[PDB]
Amino acid sequence: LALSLTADQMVSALLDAEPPILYSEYDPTRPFSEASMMGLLTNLADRELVHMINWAKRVPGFVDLTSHDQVHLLECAWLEILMIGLVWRSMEHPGKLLFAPNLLLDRNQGKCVEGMVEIFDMLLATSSRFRMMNLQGEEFVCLKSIILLNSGVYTFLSSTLKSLEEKDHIHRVLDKITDTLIHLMAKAGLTLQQQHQRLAQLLLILSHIRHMSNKGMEHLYSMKCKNVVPSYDLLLEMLDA
Amino acid sequence: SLALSLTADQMVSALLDAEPPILYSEYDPTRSMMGLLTNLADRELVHMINWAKRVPGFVDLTSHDQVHLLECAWLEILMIGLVWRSMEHPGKLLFAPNLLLDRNQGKCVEGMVEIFDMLLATSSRFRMMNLQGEEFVCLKSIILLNSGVYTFLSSTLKSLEEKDHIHRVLDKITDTLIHLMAKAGLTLQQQHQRLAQLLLILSHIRHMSNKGMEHLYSVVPSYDLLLEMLDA
Secondary structure (H helix, E strand, O other): OHHHOOHHHHHHHHHHHOOOOOOOOOOOOOOOOHHHHHHHHHHHHHHHHHHHHHHHHOOOOHHHOOHHHHHHHHHHHHHHHHHHHHHHHHOOOOOEEEEEOOEEEEHHHHOOOOOHHHHHHHHHHHHHHHHHHOOOHHHHHHHHHHHHHHOOHHHOOOOOHHHHHHHHHHHHHHHHHHHHHHHHHHHOOOOHHHHHHHHHHHHHHHHHHHHHHHHHHHHHHHOOOHHHOOOHHHHHHHHHO | OOHHHOOHHHHHHHHHHOOOOOOOOOOOOOOOHHHHHHHHHHHHHHHHHHHHOOOOOOOOOOHHHHHHHHHHHHHHHHHHHHHHHOOOOOOEEEEEOOEEEEHHHHHHOOOOHHHHHHHHHHHHHHHHHOOOHHHHHHHHHHHHHHOOOOOOOOOOHHHHHHHHHHHHHHHHHHHHHHHHHHHOOOOHHHHHHHHHHHHHHHHHHHHHHHHHHHHHOOOOOOHHHHHHHHOO
């Protein structure tokens, strides 16, 4: 039934599915150490993950997939989804990252963790780009849903008829979200030329969000913090429950 | 800028004309892996620099910004060329006409099959979409211009002017991509769907490049090398 939705109903579904804004652990000892900041950020990420699974299950077409394919997509996207949410939260705070309403950090505090100021700088540049483009909430939700469906679709094993069907379904849903993004842009008064230029501008930022995730993963490993990454089993458990 | 005055057909012609040749592995037929690929990629890089200088709009940038874009995009450009070459060889990667490898040969290298497998999947996707050569060159130029444009370290007026220019050129390639699709008979809906399909594969190419880099240092041209190669 997901591919029978209209553009306006897809928009409505995605806005209704949005997860809550969570708070960081209240009153930590400030200033931070590297260990304590990572501790606060890990704790917040672990709690956001549960709500991300709930959101994902309400993205039209996601639960049509096998549980295995749902986990693979989440495995592939989760850090990108957390990151774009952060960028969105931070749009109205130039020069700062709004990790939580009670955890607003500027660049110089990313220094307290080794290697994170580079990633801080990349996240701040993405928030500046979103601000420059006047990204709209309805566009953000579509972009976040694209990330979920797209990031892992190309690394499916995907060699049987069923898998061809799964990948085909994902690409049809992704076409529907493109239709939706274009509809939102037409309704706002953009010419056809402006519509296609803005769609491309938004999808190309996704490549930078990928980059940021890859570099973030690198450092969640460089700091010997691989047990911070949600396992296949954990993700599967959250999906079934 | 001359780039911003080009029609879609003039942009495609420019990019097709700039295409580099398909090089051969130096393997001697009448007579090992990583060196064959490194030697090949080294020779490909020289051609890439001269290709880049022919992408409309690229030479309007400062040399420093040209280098930054090449630094950020060179492995993704190599990869998309590989994937394009291998399109008509399902299950195989055509590194060169005399170096056609399948999974089994990817496993032998401690240079992983993980990346081999991701490249094959990109080739399958291109095949499945009937990717056209005119679309390919557009995509290769979008990688060059886009991959580095969010990581310029400067905030001078010039840096703002440079970023704006890159996005205007990128807008011209979008237009070009859409025109090609309209000329081919796609509906307005099919045009924007296919454009999105193409651009979202670029997120996977970025992923493969990042996994390839982390394998490469598990050889990469430095800023100074690229700069030297540029002013020539």
